[PDB]
RNA sequence: GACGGUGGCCAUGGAAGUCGGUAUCCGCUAAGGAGUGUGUAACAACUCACCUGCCAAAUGGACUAGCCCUGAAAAUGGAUGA
């Protein structure tokens, strides 16, 4: 994960759809990049600056450019990183074909990813965060060893990591 | 200003349920024809939108 | 059928005076005087004092019962009109030819020369009592005004229906003079 | 039963009429499958083709197949005139917004190849169709779109159709 | 019959009577314009200290609880028979609830037919009117005047309060321009006690 | 009023509730479908389910069978006998 940084200097807002391997089949939106002063190739690069290997399709990620250059931007969705780290490999050659999520421990990842989008989302932190993100991806399971919203309802993780990302 | 005018125009001409056993122009809440040829009926469809 | 109807009452403001004789009312107000007849069976239509006019119906059918309310509504309308008159703002529109409308209060008539490039001077006389006046906002409207709603609306309708090309597609054009604001009443 | 099985069909009054029609039908069908006007590869109407085939003279048969007869017909006019017995390839230049509808009409109608779709650029497709179908293609794009459509030849001609000899 | 239908009413009864005797202080707020985006920031600050509990016209189902407490429902300031209400509950912070409720307000233009906040100024003058939007003004039956070198209907003062419907034209005008008349959200009517009124006085600060 | 996770996960010029595939859960709630259409490259915006204020006593529906209407067009003029 890059360090979470605020917008400063010139601010060019971009909405990159993918970012594990950026545009393979022009999977990034080709209208949005050149409209905000950034070539297609250039856009491809800076897609991977936000999330190099965790970037999946249908992203809510913000690629900001301070003085038309990457400031090591973080802010991305909870849903992306979480899904990504269940079965780690996420480029654009494994994301052109269907794939099943891994059944591995993911409790410590969700708390960090919860407030990766924003600091405050106007919802209950430390109480039902694992209940939300343990079943955000209804297909498959978070971890097969435990049961979502039964052994994770009372059991919560985080205290500084749940409200602010690392 | 201009769109308002257009919508007004539509209001009296285009937005009316147009029957079926009859082709009588009714009104957007219609569930009958009010014609004793149609037999009142409950075959109301919307009047179609513009197409070039 | 034959249930016995209750009354339908309509309030009367102290500005106006409502007469009634032989099941046929006459509101008189500051603005003018409207008159209307109502012909039905056992429809006692009376005055309580000068605050409530009552309409009744002893042993009404469903049909008979329905019309009582209508009657009441019509008298309410009359009451409204004779104390604070109805105003119908009509906007006219077409997407190329500017529709040339001009009023003649001497004749009590609206005339429309252009509308679809039709070289006829399409005119019709406004109903008795009501008038139009050439109000401008960018050469877009005409505002009809009157005592009687029934007449006023008819007038509006006449110039609406006339103002419309009657050949080929109805959706493609916007030609016509249509009623925009009808709920508004002239200010006193 | 025997008569039905081994016997041949005989024309009654109704059937005589049908017979007359039949010849007309056959000529209409067999001749109009594959051809273009001399000088360049362009589509052209059936009447002209019919005239051409009459000039050289042809007698249709119900004992032969229609497809078979088509080949025969074209044989005559390959010697006489310059004609196209095979397919051609087209290239359309579609807009991004208005072209989707057009594409959906074309896709089940004929084979689409070299389909290059872009957001920042105009959509490009290429077809495989007979010489008489170009007109059909171009026409349906214009009335559906409500604007002009650029028709370009990808190739003037291409193999297969009645050139592979079915 | 009763205590049935889609998403049952009986359920709501449990919330509006049994949890109406488990808090020290209360505040009767007004929710006739605030959204859900605005309101969920006032269901975190309030939720931590107490709750926002009301089934809406379930104060008449509170009469079983009024046997011991003797709570005012129609007797307090605002009889609650003309406006929507949502009772704010609090026990940890009874002092720091009356002002943090007003901090989460968000300003915006008026709407067609809305009940409206306390203050509603209509746009007028050079800043509050455009030259292109004079046509609209002309269309209206009300008079138009030239004030400060601009054609306007002229009204820059309060003509409506809480529980009085704004005009359609006015609303439209508000929407069109960048004029936001007042900041609004959950607005306290009065401060409220268990079996009494603590302060029958408005507090928008 | 119709929100947060969230543009869930699939797939791709673009499909971000709303061309389409599968699951369709939780937070905060009086209540808000991983969404009923209008719309948009896709969005945004609008609309609906859903919830509630105002008003104040009945209301909504799916059937049943009486008469009546539609279904129901023919040649001299016209037949409940008039």
């Amino acid at each position: 994960m890059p360090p979470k940084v605020d917008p400063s200097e010139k601010v060019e807002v971009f909405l990159r759809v993918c970012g594990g391997e950026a545009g393979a089949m022009s999977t990034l939106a080709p209208k949005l990049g050149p409209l905000g002063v950034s070539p297609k190739k250039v856009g491809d690069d800076i897609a991977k600056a936000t999330q190099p290997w965790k970037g999946m399709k249908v992203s809510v990620k913000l690629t900001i450019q301070n003085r038309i250059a990457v400031p090591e931007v973080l802010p991305s969705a909870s849903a992306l990183v979480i899904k990504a780290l269940k079965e780690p490999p996420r480029d654009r050659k494994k994301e052109k074909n269907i794939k099943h999520n891994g059944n591995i421990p993911l409790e410590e990842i969700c708390k960090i990813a919860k407030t990766m989008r924003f600091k405050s989302l106007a919802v209950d932190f430390k109480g039902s965060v694992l209940e939300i993100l343990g079943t955000a991806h209804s297909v498959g399971c978070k971890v097969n060893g435990k049961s979502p919203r039964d052994i994770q309802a009372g059991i919560q993780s985080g205290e500084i990591e749940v409200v602010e990302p690392k | 200003i201009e769109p308002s005018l257009v919508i007004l125009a539509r209001k009296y001409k285009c937005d009316k349920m147009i029957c079926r056993k009859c082709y009588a122009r009714l009104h957007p809440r219609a569930v009958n024809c009010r014609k004793k040829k149609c037999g009142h009926s409950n075959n109301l469809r919307p009047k179609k939108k513009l197409l070039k | 059928m034959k249930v016995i109807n209750s009354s339908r009452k309509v309030q009367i403001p102290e500005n106006v005076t409502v007469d009634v004789k032989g099941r046929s009312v006459k509101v008189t107000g500051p603005r003018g005087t409207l008159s209307k007849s109502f012909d039905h069976a056992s429809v006692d239509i009376n005055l309580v004092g000068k605050k409530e006019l009552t309409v009744d119906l002893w042993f009404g059918n469903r049909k008979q019962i329905a019309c009582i309310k209508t009657i009441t509504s019509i008298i309410e309308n009359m009451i409204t009109g004779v104390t604070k008159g109805y105003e119908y703002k009509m906007r006219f529109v077409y997407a190329h030819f500017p529709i040339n409308v001009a009023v003649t209060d001497g004749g009590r008539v609206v005339e429309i020369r252009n509308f679809f490039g039709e070289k006829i001077v399409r005119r019709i006389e406004l109903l008795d009592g009501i008038t139009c006046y050439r109000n401008e906002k960018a050469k877009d409207e005409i505002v009809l005004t009157g005592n009687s709603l029934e007449l006023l609306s008819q007038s509006c309708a006449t110039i609406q229906l006339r103002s419309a090309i009657k050949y080929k597609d109805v959706r493609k054009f916007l030609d016509g003079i249509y009623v925009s604001e009808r709920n508004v009443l002239e200010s006193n | 039963k025997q008569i039905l099985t081994k016997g041949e069909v005989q024309v009654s009054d109704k059937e005589r009429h049908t017979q007359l029609e039949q010849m007309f039908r056959d000529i209409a069908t067999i001749v109009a499958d594959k051809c273009v006007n001399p000088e360049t590869k362009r589509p052209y109407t059936v009447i002209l083709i019919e005239r051409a085939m009459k000039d050289i003279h042809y007698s249709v048969k119900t004992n032969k197949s229609t497809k078979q007869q088509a080949l025969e017909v074209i044989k005559q006019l390959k010697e006489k005139m310059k004609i196209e017995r095979a397919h051609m390839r087209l290239r359309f230049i579609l807009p991004v917004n208005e072209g989707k509808k057009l594409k959906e009409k074309l896709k089940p109608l004929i084979k689409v190849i070299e389909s290059e779709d872009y957001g920042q650029q105009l959509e490009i497709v290429c077809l495989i169709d007979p010489g008489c179908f170009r007109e059909i293609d171009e026409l349906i794009k214009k009335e559906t779109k409500g604007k002009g459509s650029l028709e370009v030849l990808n190739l003037k001609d291409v193999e297969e159709g009645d050139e592979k000899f079915e | 019959m009763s205590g049935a239908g889609s998403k049952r009413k009986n359920v709501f009864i449990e919330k509006a009577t049994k949890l109406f005797t488990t808090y020290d202080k209360m505040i009767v707020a007004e929710a006739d314009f605030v959204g859900s985006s605005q309101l969920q920031k006032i269901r975190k600050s309030i939720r931590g200290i107490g709750a926002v509990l009301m089934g809406k016209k379930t104060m008449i189902r509170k009469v079983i609880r009024d046997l011991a407490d003797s709570k005012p429902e129609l007797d307090a300031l605002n009889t609650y028979l003309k406006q929507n209400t949502c009772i704010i509950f609090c026990k940890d912070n009874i002092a720091e609830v009356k002002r943090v409720i007003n901090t989460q307000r968000v300003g915006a233009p008026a709407k067609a037919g809305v009940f409206a906040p306390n203050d509603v100024i209509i746009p007028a003058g050079p800043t509050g009117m455009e030259p292109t939007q004079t046509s609209f003004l002309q269309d209206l039956k009300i008079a138009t005047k030239i004030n400060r070198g601009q054609i306007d209907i002229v009204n820059e003062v309060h003509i409506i309060k809480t529980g009085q419907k704004v005009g359609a034209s006015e609303a439209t005008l508000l929407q069109k321009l960048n004029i936001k008349p007042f900041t609004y959200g959950l607005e306290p009517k009065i401060i409220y006690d268990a079996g009494a009124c603590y302060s029958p006085s408005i507090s928008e600060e």
Side-chain angles (χ1 to χ4, degrees):
Chain A
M1 297 182 289
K4 190 168 180 179
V5 290
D6 296 297
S8 57
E9 313 299 314
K10 182 168 69 175
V11 182
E12 298 183 325
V13 179
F14 289 111
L15 292 174
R16 303 308 189 181
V17 180
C18 302
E21 211 186 326
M25 314 176 204
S26 307
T27 55
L28 306 187
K31 194 186 288 189
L32 303 180
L35 191 66
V37 190
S38 180
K40 178 60 173 175
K41 195 73 175 290
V42 173
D44 285 305
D45 297 344
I46 68 170
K48 300 186 283 289
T50 311
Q51 296 292 346
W53 207 46
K54 304 183 190 179
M56 297 179 61
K57 64 176 72 176
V58 198
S59 295
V60 202
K61 63 168 69 176
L62 289 175
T63 302
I64 58 163
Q65 302 288 114
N66 311 0
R67 298 260 71 95
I68 190 155
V70 298
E72 307 298 317
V73 68
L74 183 63
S76 297
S78 314
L80 299 165
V81 297
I82 287 167
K83 188 59 170 65
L85 294 164
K86 290 194 298 293
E87 197 184 48
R90 291 287 186 279
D91 302 314
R92 203 47 42 192
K93 308 294 171 290
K94 201 169 184 179
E95 314 217 56
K96 75 191 176 173
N97 46 61
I98 61 171
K99 57 188 176 298
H100 190 77
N101 58 260
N103 303 139
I104 55 168
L106 209 74
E107 299 179 312
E108 311 309 315
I109 301 299
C110 292
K111 61 167 186 181
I112 300 156
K114 180 63 184 183
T115 52
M116 195 190 283
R117 190 73 285 266
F118 288 108
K119 296 285 186 175
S120 299
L121 297 165
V123 285
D124 185 40
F125 299 135
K126 187 58 169 63
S128 305
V129 175
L130 282 65
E131 296 176 72
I132 291 158
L133 299 169
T135 189
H137 315 301
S138 299
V139 297
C141 61
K142 187 196 211 178
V143 56
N144 199 51
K146 303 187 77 172
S147 298
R149 306 169 279 128
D150 273 322
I151 328 183
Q152 305 181 353
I155 305 303
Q156 297 284 298
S157 301
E159 63 294 307
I160 198 170
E161 298 179 51
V162 76
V163 292
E164 298 184 322
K166 298 195 295 194
Chain B
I1 302 166
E2 177 168 21
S4 309
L5 293 164
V6 172
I7 64 168
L8 271 161
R10 286 179 65 73
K11 199 177 166 286
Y12 303 110
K13 300 302 191 66
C14 307
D15 314 333
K16 309 198 150 180
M17 288 285 210
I18 208 79
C19 195
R20 228 196 279 246
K21 307 181 74 163
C22 189
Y23 314 108
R25 189 149 73 213
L26 299 335
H27 68 102
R29 282 204 209 159
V31 291
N32 298 119
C33 202
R34 78 244 181 162
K35 308 294 197 185
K36 75 182 285 286
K37 297 176 185 296
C38 187
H40 303 301
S41 81
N42 217 120
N43 284 288
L44 298 314
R45 70 176 203 285
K47 190 188 178 195
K48 292 190 172 63
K49 202 162 181 299
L50 190 65
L51 179 64
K52 189 262 189 291
Chain C
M1 275 177 178
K2 299 174 198 71
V3 296
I4 308 163
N5 200 242
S6 191
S7 299
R8 287 283 291 102
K9 299 187 190 70
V10 63
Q11 65 171 92
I12 310 168
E14 295 185 46
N15 299 101
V16 306
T17 305
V18 187
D19 284 298
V20 55
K21 176 172 168 58
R23 324 203 188 190
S24 299
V25 310
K26 291 190 180 291
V27 303
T28 304
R31 297 180 67 79
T33 303
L34 303 172
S35 299
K36 192 73 171 175
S37 296
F38 298 91
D39 287 78
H40 301 89
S42 307
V43 175
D44 253 298
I45 187 171
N46 316 320
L47 293 166
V48 177
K50 205 190 91 288
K51 288 178 172 59
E52 285 186 327
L53 189 160
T54 192
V55 192
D56 294 74
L57 176 61
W58 298 93
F59 305 101
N61 292 354
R62 194 174 158 193
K63 283 197 177 63
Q64 291 196 254
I65 282 159
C67 71
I68 297 307
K69 177 143 186 284
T70 302
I71 292 155
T72 300
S73 60
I74 294 160
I75 62 178
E76 200 191 332
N77 273 304
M78 286 175 75
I79 287 162
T80 313
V82 83
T83 188
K84 35 179 156 61
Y86 295 107
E87 176 185 48
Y88 273 44
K89 301 189 180 292
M90 294 192 75
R91 292 180 72 187
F92 49 82
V93 61
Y94 185 71
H96 182 273
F97 300 122
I99 165 165
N100 302 137
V101 191
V103 186
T104 313
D105 295 71
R108 199 180 69 265
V109 57
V110 190
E111 304 205 348
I112 311 95
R113 281 74 52 198
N114 269 122
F115 54 99
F116 211 79
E118 283 185 39
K119 299 196 295 177
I120 56 167
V121 48
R122 200 143 182 168
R123 65 190 286 271
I124 192 159
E125 306 304 305
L126 300 172
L127 281 297
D128 292 314
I130 84 96
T131 63
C132 179
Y133 74 115
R134 177 48 164 185
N135 191 206
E136 292 201 80
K137 55 167 278 184
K139 203 192 175 176
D140 188 26
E141 76 200 319
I142 55 173
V143 181
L144 292 87
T145 328
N147 296 146
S148 194
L149 184 49
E150 291 173 294
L151 298 172
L152 171 54
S153 299
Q154 258 156 0
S155 322
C156 304
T158 49
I159 62 198
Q160 190 172 288
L161 298 196
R162 278 171 165 275
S163 302
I165 183 153
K166 299 193 172 179
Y167 283 84
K168 295 265 192 313
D169 188 279
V170 191
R171 301 85 129 265
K172 69 98 171 214
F173 66 76
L174 311 167
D175 176 47
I177 315 198
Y178 305 88
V179 175
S180 300
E181 294 290 345
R182 55 176 74 166
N183 286 252
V184 299
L185 312 174
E186 191 171 27
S187 298
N188 273 307
Chain D
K1 189 177 184 176
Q2 291 181 82
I3 291 161
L4 184 58
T5 49
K6 299 165 192 178
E8 59 168 281
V9 72
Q10 185 194 328
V11 303
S12 74
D13 186 49
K14 288 186 182 164
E15 302 217 66
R16 174 259 295 187
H17 283 91
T18 316
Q19 198 227 335
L20 295 169
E21 291 191 81
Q22 186 68 44
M23 296 301 162
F24 306 145
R25 280 178 293 190
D26 301 346
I27 63 171
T29 310
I30 295 159
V31 176
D33 293 308
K34 288 290 193 299
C35 258
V36 295
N37 66 80
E39 196 65 36
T40 78
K41 305 302 189 178
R42 293 168 284 182
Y44 75 153
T45 55
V46 178
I47 191 165
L48 306 171
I49 323 192
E50 293 293 313
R51 189 182 81 263
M53 82 89 184
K54 285 175 183 291
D55 271 55
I56 197 67
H57 304 288
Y58 190 85
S59 297
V60 294
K61 300 291 185 297
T62 54
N63 306 147
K64 303 171 185 173
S65 300
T66 53
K67 184 63 171 181
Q68 187 188 131
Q69 283 175 119
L71 299 175
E72 293 174 71
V73 167
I74 65 189
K75 185 65 177 295
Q76 291 186 322
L77 303 175
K78 184 65 173 184
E79 296 170 37
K80 191 187 182 179
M81 310 192 298
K82 178 172 163 291
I83 54 166
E84 169 157 311
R85 300 191 285 186
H87 300 146
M88 56 160 58
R89 290 186 158 188
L90 308 175
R91 183 185 66 155
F92 285 128
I93 298 89
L94 293 78
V96 181
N97 312 137
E98 303 179 64
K100 294 178 283 83
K101 63 189 171 178
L102 305 187
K103 194 190 290 184
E104 296 312 331
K105 290 200 172 188
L106 295 166
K107 184 177 177 69
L109 191 67
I110 42 170
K111 295 188 287 183
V112 184
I113 55 162
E114 311 175 77
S115 181
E116 308 182 81
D117 293 334
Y118 303 84
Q120 67 185 359
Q121 291 186 131
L122 298 168
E123 294 213 316
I124 308 296
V125 294
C126 301
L127 287 304
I128 309 176
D129 56 292
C132 310
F133 215 73
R134 184 191 194 178
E135 190 184 82
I136 293 161
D137 288 313
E138 71 194 77
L139 184 66
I140 62 168
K141 296 179 81 76
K142 297 165 189 176
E143 298 320 320
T144 307
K145 180 160 62 164
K147 297 291 175 292
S149 186
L150 301 173
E151 178 71 300
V152 181
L153 296 171
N154 200 28
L155 295 175
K156 65 177 74 174
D157 46 42
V158 69
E159 66 187 329
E160 304 194 326
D162 295 64
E163 196 173 26
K164 69 184 173 184
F165 305 118
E166 305 187 86
Chain E
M1 291 168 66
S2 53
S6 300
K7 307 190 181 185
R8 295 205 295 121
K9 309 303 182 294
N10 192 254
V11 172
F12 308 155
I13 306 309
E14 294 200 318
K15 300 169 190 180
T17 192
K18 303 180 194 300
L19 291 78
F20 269 46
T21 182
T22 61
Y23 297 93
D24 297 314
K25 299 293 185 183
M26 302 90 183
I27 309 176
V28 180
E30 187 168 298
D32 290 86
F33 33 84
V34 69
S36 288
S37 297
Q38 295 173 231
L39 189 63
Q40 85 201 310
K41 298 187 275 72
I42 336 186
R43 290 181 258 175
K44 290 259 67 63
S45 303
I46 302 300
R47 188 209 77 100
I49 66 171
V52 179
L53 297 167
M54 192 47 178
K56 283 69 176 185
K57 202 161 188 68
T58 325
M59 72 190 180
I60 65 180
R61 297 280 283 168
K62 197 179 67 176
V63 297
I64 64 100
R65 192 61 57 181
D66 302 20
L67 298 170
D69 304 58
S70 307
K71 299 179 180 289
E73 52 202 19
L74 304 166
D75 298 296
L77 190 63
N78 301 258
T79 192
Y80 318 127
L81 304 175
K82 58 184 284 293
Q83 282 283 97
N84 192 63
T85 54
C86 46
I87 298 163
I88 307 301
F89 285 107
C90 52
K91 47 190 174 187
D92 295 314
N93 286 148
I94 63 170
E96 301 293 316
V97 57
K98 301 155 187 175
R99 66 208 64 157
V100 299
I101 193 169
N102 296 279
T103 309
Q104 307 298 343
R105 293 184 184 192
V106 183
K111 323 167 200 292
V114 71
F115 299 108
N118 293 86
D119 294 336
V120 180
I121 302 164
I122 309 307
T127 56
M129 294 292 188
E130 296 164 47
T132 55
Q133 303 190 341
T134 54
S135 56
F136 184 67
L137 304 183
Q138 283 173 130
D139 190 67
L140 300 175
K141 70 191 177 179
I142 61 171
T144 53
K145 309 93 171 179
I146 301 169
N147 297 118
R148 300 157 279 181
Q150 181 61 40
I151 300 165
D152 65 307
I153 60 164
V154 81
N155 182 52
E156 53 171 303
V157 288
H158 304 313
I159 53 162
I160 53 171
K161 317 186 196 297
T162 52
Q164 302 198 177
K165 295 186 181 294
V166 71
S169 304
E170 292 163 31
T172 311
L173 189 62
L174 274 162
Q175 285 170 244
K176 284 187 294 183
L177 300 156
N178 305 282
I179 304 300
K180 294 177 178 181
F182 192 72
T183 192
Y184 48 82
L186 283 183
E187 312 194 356
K189 294 176 171 289
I190 46 166
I191 312 307
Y192 185 53
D193 235 34
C197 300
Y198 184 50
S199 298
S201 289
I202 196 165
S203 294
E204 301 166 54
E205 307 299 340

